[PDB]
Amino acid sequence: TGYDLSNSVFSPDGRNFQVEYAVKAVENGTTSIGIKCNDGVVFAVEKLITSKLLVPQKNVKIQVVDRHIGCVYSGLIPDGRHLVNRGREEAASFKKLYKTPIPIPAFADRLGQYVQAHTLYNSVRPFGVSTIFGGVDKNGAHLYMLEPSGSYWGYKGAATGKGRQSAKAELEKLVDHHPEGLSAREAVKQAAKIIYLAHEDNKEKDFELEISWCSLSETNGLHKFVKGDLLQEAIDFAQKEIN
Amino acid sequence: GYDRALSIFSPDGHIFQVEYALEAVKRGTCAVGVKGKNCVVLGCERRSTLKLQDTRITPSKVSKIDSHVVLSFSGLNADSRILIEKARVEAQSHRLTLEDPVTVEYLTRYVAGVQQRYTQSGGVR
Amino acid sequence: MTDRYSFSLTTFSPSGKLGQIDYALTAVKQGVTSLGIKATNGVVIATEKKSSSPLAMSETLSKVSLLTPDIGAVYSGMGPDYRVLVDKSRKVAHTSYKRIYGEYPPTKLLVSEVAKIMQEATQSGGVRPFGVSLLIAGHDEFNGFSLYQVDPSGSYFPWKATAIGKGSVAAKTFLEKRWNDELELEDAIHIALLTLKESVEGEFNGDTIELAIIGDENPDLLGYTGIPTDKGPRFRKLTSQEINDRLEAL
Amino acid sequence: GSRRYDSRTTIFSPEGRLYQVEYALESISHAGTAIGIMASDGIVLAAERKVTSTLLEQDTSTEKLYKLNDKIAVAVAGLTADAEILINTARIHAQNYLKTYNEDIPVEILVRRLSDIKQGYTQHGGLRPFGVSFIYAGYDDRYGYQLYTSNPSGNYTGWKAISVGANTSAAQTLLQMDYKDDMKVDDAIELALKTLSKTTDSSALTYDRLEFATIRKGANDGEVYQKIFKPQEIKDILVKTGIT
Amino acid sequence: SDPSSINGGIVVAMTGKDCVAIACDLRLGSQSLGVSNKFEKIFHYGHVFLGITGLATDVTTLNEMFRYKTNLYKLKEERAIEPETFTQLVSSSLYERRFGPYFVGPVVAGINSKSGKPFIAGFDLIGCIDEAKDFIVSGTASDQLFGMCESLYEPNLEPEDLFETISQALLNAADRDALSGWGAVVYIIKKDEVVKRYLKMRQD
Amino acid sequence: GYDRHITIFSPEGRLYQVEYAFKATNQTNINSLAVRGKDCTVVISQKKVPDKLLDPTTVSYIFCISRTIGMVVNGPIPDARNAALRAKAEAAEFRYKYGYDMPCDVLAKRMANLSQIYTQRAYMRPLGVILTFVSVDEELGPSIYKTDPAGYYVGYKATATGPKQQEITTNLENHFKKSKIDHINEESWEKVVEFAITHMIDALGTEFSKNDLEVGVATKDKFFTLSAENIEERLVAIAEQ
Amino acid sequence: NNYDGDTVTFSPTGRLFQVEYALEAIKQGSVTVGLRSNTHAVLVALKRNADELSSYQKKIIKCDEHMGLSLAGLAPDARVLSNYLRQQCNYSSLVFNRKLAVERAGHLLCDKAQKNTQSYGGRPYGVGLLIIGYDKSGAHLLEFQPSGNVTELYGTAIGARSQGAKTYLERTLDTFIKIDGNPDELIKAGVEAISQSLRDESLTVDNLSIAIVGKDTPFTIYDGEAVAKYI
Amino acid sequence: TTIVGVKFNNGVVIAADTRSTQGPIVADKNCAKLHRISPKIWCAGAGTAADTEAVTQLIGSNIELHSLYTSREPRVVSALQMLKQHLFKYQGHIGAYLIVAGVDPTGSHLFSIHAHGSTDVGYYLSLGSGSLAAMAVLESHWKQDLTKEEAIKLASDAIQAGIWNDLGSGSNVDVCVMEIGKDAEYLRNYLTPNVREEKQKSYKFPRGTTAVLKESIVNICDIQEE
Amino acid sequence: TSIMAVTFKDGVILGADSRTTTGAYIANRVTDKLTRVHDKIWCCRSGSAADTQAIADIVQYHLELYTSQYGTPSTETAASVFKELCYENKDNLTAGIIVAGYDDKNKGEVYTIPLGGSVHKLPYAIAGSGSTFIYGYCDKNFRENMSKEETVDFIKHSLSQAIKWDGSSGGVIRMVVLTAAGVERLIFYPDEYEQL
Numbered sequence A: 001t002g003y004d005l006s007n008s009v010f011s012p013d014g015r016n017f018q019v020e021y022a023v024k025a026v027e028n029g030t031t032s033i034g035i036k037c038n039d040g041v042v043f044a045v046e047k048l049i050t051s052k053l054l055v056p057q058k059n060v061k062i063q064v065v066d067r068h069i070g071c072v073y074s075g076l077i078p079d080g081r082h083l084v085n086r087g088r089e090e091a092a093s094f095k096k097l098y099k100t101p102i103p104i105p106a107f108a109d110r111l112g113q114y115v116q117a118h119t120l121y122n123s124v125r126p127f128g129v130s131t132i133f134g135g136v137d138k139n140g141a142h143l144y145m146l147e148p149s150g151s152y153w154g155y156k157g158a159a160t161g162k163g164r165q166s167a168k169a170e171l172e173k174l175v176d177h178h179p180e181g182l183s184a185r186e187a188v189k190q191a192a193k194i195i196y197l198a199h200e201d202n203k204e205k206d207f208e209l210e211i212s213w214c215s216l217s218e219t220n221g222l223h224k225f226v227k228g229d230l231l232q233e234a235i236d237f238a239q240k241e242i243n
Numbered sequence B: 001g002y003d004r005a006l007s008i009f010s011p012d013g014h015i016f017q018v019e020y021a022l023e024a025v026k027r028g029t030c031a032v033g034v035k036g037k038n039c040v041v042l043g044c045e046r047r048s049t050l051k052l053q054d055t056r057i058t059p060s061k062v063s064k065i066d067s068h069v070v071l072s073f074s075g076l077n078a079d080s081r082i083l084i085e086k087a088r089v090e091a092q093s094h095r096l097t098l099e100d101p102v103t104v105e106y107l108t109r110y111v112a113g114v115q116q117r118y119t120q121s122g123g124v125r
Numbered sequence C: 001m002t003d004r005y006s007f008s009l010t011t012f013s014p015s016g017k018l019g020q021i022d023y024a025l026t027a028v029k030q031g032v033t034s035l036g037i038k039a040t041n042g043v044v045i046a047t048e049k050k051s052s053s054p055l056a057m058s059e060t061l062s063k064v065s066l067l068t069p070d071i072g073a074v075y076s077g078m079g080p081d082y083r084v085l086v087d088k089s090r091k092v093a094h095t096s097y098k099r100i101y102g103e104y105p106p107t108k109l110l111v112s113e114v115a116k117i118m119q120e121a122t123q124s125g126g127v128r129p130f131g132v133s134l135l136i137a138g139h140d141e142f143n144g145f146s147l148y149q150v151d152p153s154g155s156y157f158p159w160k161a162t163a164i165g166k167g168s169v170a171a172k173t174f175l176e177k178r179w180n181d182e183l184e185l186e187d188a189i190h191i192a193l194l195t196l197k198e199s200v201e202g203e204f205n206g207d208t209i210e211l212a213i214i215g216d217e218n219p220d221l222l223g224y225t226g227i228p229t230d231k232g233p234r235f236r237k238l239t240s241q242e243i244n245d246r247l248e249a250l
Numbered sequence D: 001g002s003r004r005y006d007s008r009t010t011i012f013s014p015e016g017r018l019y020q021v022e023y024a025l026e027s028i029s030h031a032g033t034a035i036g037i038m039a040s041d042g043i044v045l046a047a048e049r050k051v052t053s054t055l056l057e058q059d060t061s062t063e064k065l066y067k068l069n070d071k072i073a074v075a076v077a078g079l080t081a082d083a084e085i086l087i088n089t090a091r092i093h094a095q096n097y098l099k100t101y102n103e104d105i106p107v108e109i110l111v112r113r114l115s116d117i118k119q120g121y122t123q124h125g126g127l128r129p130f131g132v133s134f135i136y137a138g139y140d141d142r143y144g145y146q147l148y149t150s151n152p153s154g155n156y157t158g159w160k161a162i163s164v165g166a167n168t169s170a171a172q173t174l175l176q177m178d179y180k181d182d183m184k185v186d187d188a189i190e191l192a193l194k195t196l197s198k199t200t201d202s203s204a205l206t207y208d209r210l211e212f213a214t215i216r217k218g219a220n221d222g223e224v225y226q227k228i229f230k231p232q233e234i235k236d237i238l239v240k241t242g243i244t
Numbered sequence E: 001s002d003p004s005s006i007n008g009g010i011v012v013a014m015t016g017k018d019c020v021a022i023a024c025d026l027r028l029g030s031q032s033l034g035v036s037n038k039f040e041k042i043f044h045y046g047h048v049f050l051g052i053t054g055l056a057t058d059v060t061t062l063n064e065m066f067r068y069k070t071n072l073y074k075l076k077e078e079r080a081i082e083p084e085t086f087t088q089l090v091s092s093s094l095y096e097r098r099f100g101p102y103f104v105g106p107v108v109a110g111i112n113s114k115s116g117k118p119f120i121a122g123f124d125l126i127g128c129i130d131e132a133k134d135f136i137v138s139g140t141a142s143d144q145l146f147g148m149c150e151s152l153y154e155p156n157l158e159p160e161d162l163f164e165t166i167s168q169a170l171l172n173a174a175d176r177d178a179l180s181g182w183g184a185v186v187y188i189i190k191k192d193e194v195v196k197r198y199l200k201m202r203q204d
Numbered sequence F: 001g002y003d004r005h006i007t008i009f010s011p012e013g014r015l016y017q018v019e020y021a022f023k024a025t026n027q028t029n030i031n032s033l034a035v036r037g038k039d040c041t042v043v044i045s046q047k048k049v050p051d052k053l054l055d056p057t058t059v060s061y062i063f064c065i066s067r068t069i070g071m072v073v074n075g076p077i078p079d080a081r082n083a084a085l086r087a088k089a090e091a092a093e094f095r096y097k098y099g100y101d102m103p104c105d106v107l108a109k110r111m112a113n114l115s116q117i118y119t120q121r122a123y124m125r126p127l128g129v130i131l132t133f134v135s136v137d138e139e140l141g142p143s144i145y146k147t148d149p150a151g152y153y154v155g156y157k158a159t160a161t162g163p164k165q166q167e168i169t170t171n172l173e174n175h176f177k178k179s180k181i182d183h184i185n186e187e188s189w190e191k192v193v194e195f196a197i198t199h200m201i202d203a204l205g206t207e208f209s210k211n212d213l214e215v216g217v218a219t220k221d222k223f224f225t226l227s228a229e230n231i232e233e234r235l236v237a238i239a240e241q
Numbered sequence G: 001n002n003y004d005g006d007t008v009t010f011s012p013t014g015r016l017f018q019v020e021y022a023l024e025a026i027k028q029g030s031v032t033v034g035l036r037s038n039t040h041a042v043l044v045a046l047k048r049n050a051d052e053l054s055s056y057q058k059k060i061i062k063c064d065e066h067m068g069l070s071l072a073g074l075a076p077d078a079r080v081l082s083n084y085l086r087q088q089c090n091y092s093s094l095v096f097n098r099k100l101a102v103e104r105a106g107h108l109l110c111d112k113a114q115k116n117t118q119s120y121g122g123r124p125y126g127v128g129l130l131i132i133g134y135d136k137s138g139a140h141l142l143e144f145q146p147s148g149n150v151t152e153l154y155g156t157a158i159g160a161r162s163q164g165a166k167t168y169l170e171r172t173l174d175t176f177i178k179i180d181g182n183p184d185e186l187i188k189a190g191v192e193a194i195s196q197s198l199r200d201e202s203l204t205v206d207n208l209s210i211a212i213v214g215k216d217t218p219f220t221i222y223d224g225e226a227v228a229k230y231i
Numbered sequence H: 001t002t003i004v005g006v007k008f009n010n011g012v013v014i015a016a017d018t019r020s021t022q023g024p025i026v027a028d029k030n031c032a033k034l035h036r037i038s039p040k041i042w043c044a045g046a047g048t049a050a051d052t053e054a055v056t057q058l059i060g061s062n063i064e065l066h067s068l069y070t071s072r073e074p075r076v077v078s079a080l081q082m083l084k085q086h087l088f089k090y091q092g093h094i095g096a097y098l099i100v101a102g103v104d105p106t107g108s109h110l111f112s113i114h115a116h117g118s119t120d121v122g123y124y125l126s127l128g129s130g131s132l133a134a135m136a137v138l139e140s141h142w143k144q145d146l147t148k149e150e151a152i153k154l155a156s157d158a159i160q161a162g163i164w165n166d167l168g169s170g171s172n173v174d175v176c177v178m179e180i181g182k183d184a185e186y187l188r189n190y191l192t193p194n195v196r197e198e199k200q201k202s203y204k205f206p207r208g209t210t211a212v213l214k215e216s217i218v219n220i221c222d223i224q225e226e
Numbered sequence I: 001t002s003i004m005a006v007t008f009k010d011g012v013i014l015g016a017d018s019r020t021t022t023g024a025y026i027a028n029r030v031t032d033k034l035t036r037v038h039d040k041i042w043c044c045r046s047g048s049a050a051d052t053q054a055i056a057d058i059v060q061y062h063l064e065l066y067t068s069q070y071g072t073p074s075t076e077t078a079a080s081v082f083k084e085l086c087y088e089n090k091d092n093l094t095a096g097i098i099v100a101g102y103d104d105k106n107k108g109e110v111y112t113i114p115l116g117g118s119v120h121k122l123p124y125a126i127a128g129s130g131s132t133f134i135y136g137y138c139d140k141n142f143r144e145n146m147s148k149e150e151t152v153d154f155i156k157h158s159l160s161q162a163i164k165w166d167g168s169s170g171g172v173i174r175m176v177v178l179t180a181a182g183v184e185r186l187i188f189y190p191d192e193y194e195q196l
């Protein structure tokens, strides 16, 4: 034993225990989801209200990369910010050299390689976040989810955090009941519902809902936050479904 | 580069590497210094375990740092050469810039300063 | 990041042993048998092509390697370590000699450079020793034919004949009885094939044996004509057929 | 991080000893014995090759005695590969001095430089020390014929007669007994071989298990000649002294 | 201003029957001022002889450099360097200073100790090798030396004849150059004996 | 026992980190196979999409390294993509420096040397992957070269990698013992893919739908991967005889 | 236990112990309170002395004319972080002629603290900060933790016994938020809030430290007889 | 200098003159301008002599190491690419103007390289001070589908044009033929149309003609024994 | 040098002369100035031959590496890589490049990159020393959405005049057609184009 004391050490299994311990930090965090729709993607996250002293709508969690990519994550918040800062550098240098905004699959590998690099040495710690991200590019909509190991795949729907199992079940129903696809406005409503349903795992404290979206029709392929009437409409739809 | 902190504090407020260096000095051959009214004498011990030695060429214990200052030592012989060399270089450097040979106090303060630096620098004992 | 292993991973133990070097020699002992014999008019080096799978094309894996036109090498131990050493050995022959003196290094000095690289992996920071022993056969104008062994420590010794790896202890005894100072090259090849048959279990033919010689100059292998002083490489790798011909007169 | 795997090669023991230096000296005590004897008219260097084979090419072999320049030579005891690293550095230092001052390097200055390099590996860098001990045999016009030794600690001392490697305790006693100040080279040759013949772990001392060298003013008029003995010449001097 | 003609000097080399010869003048000056008449330009490393013309600081520097390199070569190889090999070492050493060169004009001369074949070679300041069968020239009076060598020289001359030919080539070339002269030295080289002769010449 | 944490020798002359990297190779539980035709080299691999929420089009362990070279990986995807990105970079650099397309065997050697370095240098860990490179080389013809975490590599007549490699290996061995040739004597690559799938079915004992497989084909001057519908056509032809 | 030797090591439950130990240093530190209305933002800090001959350690540091913080924990680490904020506030002014947003100031502190938690050799910061400021979107209050987490709040408190003040503010939320255009009443509420964290000792003239920033009020610190009015 | 390259039926041939100059003086009358990069890849060089030699040795050394690494015979495009990238990097300061030719597994190839790093492809090429004299001959007599014998003739004729008409060129003609599926034949001094006539007189002196001051034996031997 | 690129209905056509000069000596009379950086992205080179070759070689390397990661690059992307090299190294380079390529989505596109390193997207572009003599002709005769045969005639006639007046231009007229159909190389000899 001792194989779990140092990063980048293979155990006799062929496992990197430090990366597996980073996953525990992710599982401890709040719930965050992603939904791929007809012409775009929708991101949503659970924000725990620790106290009345928290200013509503101020502590924003979802982060934009470039102008067409949204990023949300669960686990250690600072680690996620560090990853997004790198993503913004990667996206900037791509656009600097190649002119076009970075494609989503291309952007996914940039984060993937960076996170993977933090499993190669004992002088660094793995990332304590699973990141759900995506957007709209020339080839259409893309949704991805990236783990501490550097592993990522494309997704129809994605979920991570303390309420991931509840969320995953809800996402699977949408995939089955809508083979032809889901609209962007529908996806916002559904996203609200799923977060409210996933809040049963964090039911002690009340929470604040935060949604964002990229859609070719609804937002012109740019990342925007859901605000005001459209946010309230989604909250009402969500509150109606739980009752 | 090798940056490892070898000289560090212990719970009781001791730097063991510095204290173990003193034990190396305790092992070294005896050296004595006595100052009279108009002179100073440096006495040194030569251990007689080593005969068949060539006393002409064997490194002498007392070393001239300049024409007016000498340095004897107790401890690791190889380590002493490094301090002696640095001191000899500083003595010539002082003459070059100040246009006056070092005071005995100044040369001591320099050698002592080198010894101290090696107690809180990374990668060195 | 940064390589923060700036310290030695090979150190003296209380008994005065360098553990990592000893363990590297143990890895060499597990390796497949290879040998070298020196004749009056040449040198022969040989080993078994231990194929990891019958689907694997063993011709693509070269255990006997040309370092210079008049110097060859064979090994026992870890193959990957050998491969990178051959790459470094070929390069150092150019950078530290041919680009300076305009001619290929003599056997002993190329061996010295390889030895140096292996010594540094034994003292430098954040690295383990090479897990191989080399046998380097070669010819040069002023020293004639020669055969050297190189160990993980970086130590090297010249041999009239020797063997390393799996069945080296038995093979060295076999060579002591057969070797004399009047051997022709063909006689040395014959003795090499006899010696190597003892350590091999399965098939023993041109396809499972790798054998090369340092002998006469080969103008047919030079690739060009028009310069009298260039007469061709003394290193030649024997073909599968050439080995089988000598296995009939065995 | 990486701290976990650091042996810490450059630290003191509670007794004030350098662990790695002490262990390196233990390594050297198993190496083939090398002897140096200084006479009034020259210096002898004798050394024993370690358990050889009949199939070792002796006439082209060199593991003990090395030439640093025309005036200075060394006998090695320890890891040969480590020694060659230092030998090439010493050869360079001698040429640097010759280029700078247009004079051959004094023996002590060369010795001090190599000894300072060894010292560095014991105080800083976190690397293992060189597992080598040298006997320096050399001549210059200041001190004449000189013998020195250096070890992994970087400490060096001068000698009239000295041994390094295996069985030094026994060898040093035998040298201390028969050595005299008015001794000559031919006598010192005989003493060196007789000492090895008694301290050797082998059954008998033969030509194929020895490396031999002399530094003589026995060169035509005021100059110094280095003689690295050939196998046949070692065989002859063994018959002459009456060992074989 | 021109580095190759501040100090002045010349070197010439020739081949004969089982022999080679190399010669140089002895002048060192600072432009018009003659400073030294004992500045030899021919050096030897074992049985290989090197003559160097050009800027005198670089002549001294290069001699010290090739002494350094040949001494290490000998220690490692356990044999003296040969003319053919030394020629390649000079070319290598000069070209590594391609864009900050030594302002010199080297000339190599010697007999291969194994084959017995006579060998001479010349270089430019940056490495290019001129391996001639007949003769090599270098220095401030190189044009003069080319004219003398090309007319006086004939192949397969005996050592004592070759001495006369090379000596007259040098002497008469030097006397037509303001920055060469003030004495001269000739080396006659055979496979196992080398004679060095100082020539009597006009001291202006 | 720190000789098991970093890549230094154990008393037996073994590198335990390298041996454990070999074990990570089978973490994905996927089997791959590679064979050579007359004009082509085919590589097939199992595809497993366990989650319904996954986009199955993005799940892949076959990579297009260059126009001529393809690579299938046996091991975790992060390390797989690490090796893929590097191989792509090395192949591109080779073409730029030396003026011709990097051969399959040369790329394999280069990646093998990089792997060797991780077995010798302490600060770098081995990658837990086995890389199988395939192409139709312009000199050597159809080519299969495979690299592992030890830094070992060799050419192959055919090969198999994964948890059930031995069953596939013996199946292929027995076929080449009958035919007495170093390849699949077939004109079209379509039939060589059919051979590859057929013999994997026989060896593993499992049937395959269009979404259960992943196929890569190397021909002269290009390497390409088949779509689900291209594989379906292949599966139909196998069933009809 | 075995996973607290350095910051580069997760525990089996996914915890970073060196970060948690750094968080502990804040709890040992003296209490400090932060609260705001729509017009003004106030810091109140209880300073701590070594003994009766000693001075009372300063708790509040000015970063710019419109921004500053109060500290709790390792004071030298607060000096390093406040120096960084001063530079960032200054870079924003010199390059963009723009006063640094309080929210963006928090993001910069978060990212600086984070790098120390993921790399070998270094260590986490051992201090907690309460940043107040008035920018283009009005009054703001932030809470910084050396784990990297930064949070915008109406009111809060950190340090020893900070839970008492934090509860009072949670009751008074609706009252003190409405205190607009009245600095003295907002400070009164802050002084009354920090009083809920006191035991044995009371607020004296050289014990109390108050700071305020607002609409037409530069960041100013009050000490000595300047706070006798509020005792 | 006059160097040429001519393609033919089953390969390629290059040729060169043998004159080296230092201003208006001839430094070497029998200079070797045909350099071997690899066994079946040779290049001819013009411009700065040390540069053409050095850059050819360096790329030839690296080509050899590359051939060993890849287990393949080297290609002309590899030597071409390595040369141009090296020369471009030095912005023309390495004054090498080369004609690179050879046969490899791809076929027979002929290229030119300029000091600034530009390359050109062709069936017939010429470089150097006598390139205009040579190209005049090539443009007058070259045709498609030349035989080996016809190409050697054309190439040597083009060099002769430079030898006779260009003052920077002279002496002898060197040739190298690289045919597909054959060893490359290097024909040193293929033509020798400039042998010096017998001199009218012998200038051998009488022994003792030169005045000597001192004599001495030089010790070339090592320090002696005994 | 006389180089041009022209978009038309089915795609884009590149055209160039074949003359390389060292002063007034024609070092190469059969030069290929139409060079390939990708399957259906080519460029026309003018200025230093060494500089434009070195640049094009680097661009081909970048796009080969782009393709391996992100699939086929756009013509705009290729122009951006040329620009980045020409702009950032403007002090040390003398290169006037025209980039032309065919997508299925964007169809034929032409980007010109003059000395400074600026980029200009155009319906057609002309460059090189000989382009100066045909600004008037090309402006008067160019039409959008021409046919293939019409575009070949336009380029052939334009370069014919450029060759006629410019001493640095001459030899054969090379052309490269880029459409969905593929890549076609054309050549036109002096006897054909001089009589136009």
Ligand SMILES: C#CCCCC(=O)N[C@@H](Cc1ccccc1)C(=O)N[C@@H](CC(C)C)B(O)O
Residues within 6 Å of the ligand: E123, E124, E128, E129, E130, H001, H002, H019, H020, H021, H022, H023, H027, H028, H031, H033, H045, H046, H047, H048, H049, H050, H052, H095, H128, H129, H168
């Ligand atoms: C021997 C010797 C030194 C010869 C000096 C030397 O490089 N000459 C050059 C001409 C030149 C070049 C640059 C500066 C001045 C003089 C020369 O001879 N070039 C001819 C071919 C070379 C490769 C042999 B030819 O190309 O003109």
Ligand SMILES: C#CCCCC(=O)N[C@@H](Cc1ccccc1)C(=O)N[C@@H](CC(C)C)B(O)O
Residues within 6 Å of the ligand: H114, H115, H118, I001, I002, I019, I020, I021, I022, I023, I027, I031, I033, I045, I046, I047, I048, I049, I050, I052, I094, I128, I129, I168, I169
């Ligand atoms: C030396 C040499 C041969 C290279 C000559 C060489 O680069 N010529 C240039 C003209 C030029 C340019 C800048 C510096 C000098 C000479 C040239 O011919 N450019 C034509 C196009 C290129 C791509 C072939 B064209 O613009 O006229």
Ligand SMILES: [Cl-]
Residues within 6 Å of the ligand: F109, F110, F113, F114
């Ligand atoms: Cl490599």
Ligand SMILES: [Cl-]
Residues within 6 Å of the ligand: H118, H119, I020, I031, I032, I033, I049, I053
């Ligand atoms: Cl061009």
